Amino acid sequence: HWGYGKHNGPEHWHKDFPIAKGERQSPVDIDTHTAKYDPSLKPLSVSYDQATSLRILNNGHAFNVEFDDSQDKAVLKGGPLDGTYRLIQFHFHWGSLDGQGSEHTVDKKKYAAELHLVHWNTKYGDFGKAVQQPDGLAVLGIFLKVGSAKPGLQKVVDVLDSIKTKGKSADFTNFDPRGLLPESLDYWTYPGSLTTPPLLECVTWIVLKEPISVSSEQVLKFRKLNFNGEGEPEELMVDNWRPAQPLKNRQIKASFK
Numbered sequence: 399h400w401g402y403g404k405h406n407g408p409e410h411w412h413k414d415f416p417i418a419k420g421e422r423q424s425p426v427d428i429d430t431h432t433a434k435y436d437p438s439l440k441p442l443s444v445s446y447d448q449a450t451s452l453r454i455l456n457n458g459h460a461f462n463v464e465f466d467d468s469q470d471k472a473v474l475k476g477g478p479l480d481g482t483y484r485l486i487q488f489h490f491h492w493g494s495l496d497g498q499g500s501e502h503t504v505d506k507k508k509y510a511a512e513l514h515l516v517h518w519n520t521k522y523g524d525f526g527k528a529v530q531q532p533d534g535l536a537v538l539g540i541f542l543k544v545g546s547a548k549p550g551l552q553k554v555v556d557v558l559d560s561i562k563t564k565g566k567s568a569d570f571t572n573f574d575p576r577g578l579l580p581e582s583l584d585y586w587t588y589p590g591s592l593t594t595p596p597l598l599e600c601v602t603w604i605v606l607k608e609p610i611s612v613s614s615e616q617v618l619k620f621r622k623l624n625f626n627g628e629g630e631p632e633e634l635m636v637d638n639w640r641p642a643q644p645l646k647n648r649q650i651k652a653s654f655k
C-alpha cells in the first residue's frame with residue numbers, strides 16, 4: 399500500500415508503521431551550526447576494492463544495486479562505528495525538479511538527490527537480523543547536486559531503461575562503488591532509522607559533507623523510471639524522498655571543523 403502520493407505518501411505511513419512517529423526517525427535537517435564537533439571521532443574507513451555487484455533492481459520505490467555480502471568484500475568501519483559493516487546495496491532518492499529530492503537537508507537546503515550505501519553489522523550475521531538491532535545498520539549518505547557529470551555513475555544510468563518498471567531486474571556485475579564517492583570523507587553522524595517502511599530504528603547514519611556533482615542528463619534518466627509494473631498505467635518514479643523528521647532528543651556530531 400505505501401508509497402509516495404497524496405493518499406499513501408509519507409504522511410500516511412504511521413497508520414501501517416506506527417514507529418513512523420518514533421523517537422529516532424530519519425531523515426533530519428542537519429543544522430551545521432549546532433552540530434557538535436567531536437575531535438575523538440575517527441576517519442571513516444571505506445574498503446570497497448573487493449566489491450562484487452550482482453544485480454540492479456526496480457523495486458517499485460527506487461532502484462537497488464545489490465552486492466554479494468556473503469564475505470567481507472566491501473566494508474565500512476571506523477568513523478563512529480565499533481563494528482565492521484558489510485555493503486549489501488545502494489540506492490538513491492530524487493526529485494521531480496533539481497530543487498528537491500534529498501531526504502537529509504543541510505541548513506534546510508535540499509539537494510537534487512541522495513545516495514544511500516547500506517551496510518549491516520557483521521556481528522548479526524545477516525541483514526534481516528541486523529535491522530532488528532539498534533546498532534544493526536550503517537548507512538553512508540551522499541548528496542547529489544546538478545553540474546558536471548559523475549563518470550562513475552554512467553554505467554548505472556545506462557542500464558535504467560532495462561529496468562523501467564516495478565519488479566524488473568538485470569545482471570549488473572563489475573560495478574565499482576568507489577566511483578560514486580566525493581574527495582572528502584568528512585561527515586556528520588547521528589542515530590536514526592530506515593527512511594522507508596518498515597522505518598526500523600536500526601541505523602547509524604553517516605552523511606558526507608561534500609556532495610558529488612551529476613549532470614542534468616544523468617538525473618533526467620532517473621526520472622524516466624516508473625513506480626508502476628509493466629502493463630500498468632505510467633506513473634514516473636520521482637519524489638521518492640521522505641521529508642525531514644523531528645530531531646527529538648538527538649545531537650548531530652561532526653567529524654570536522
Ligand SMILES: NS(=O)(=O)c1c(F)c(F)c(S(=O)(=O)CCO)c(NCc2ccccc2)c1F
Nearest residue numbers: 486487514516529537591592593594595596597
Ligand atoms: N533508505 S534506507 O537507506 O534508509 C532503507 C530503508 F528505509 C529500508 F526500509 C530498507 S528495507 O526495505 O530493506 C527493511 C526491510 O526489512 C533498506 N534496505 C535495503 C534492502 C532491501 C532489500 C534487500 C536488501 C537490502 C534501506 F536501505
Ligand SMILES: [Zn+2]
Nearest residue numbers: 489491514593
Ligand atoms: Zn534510502
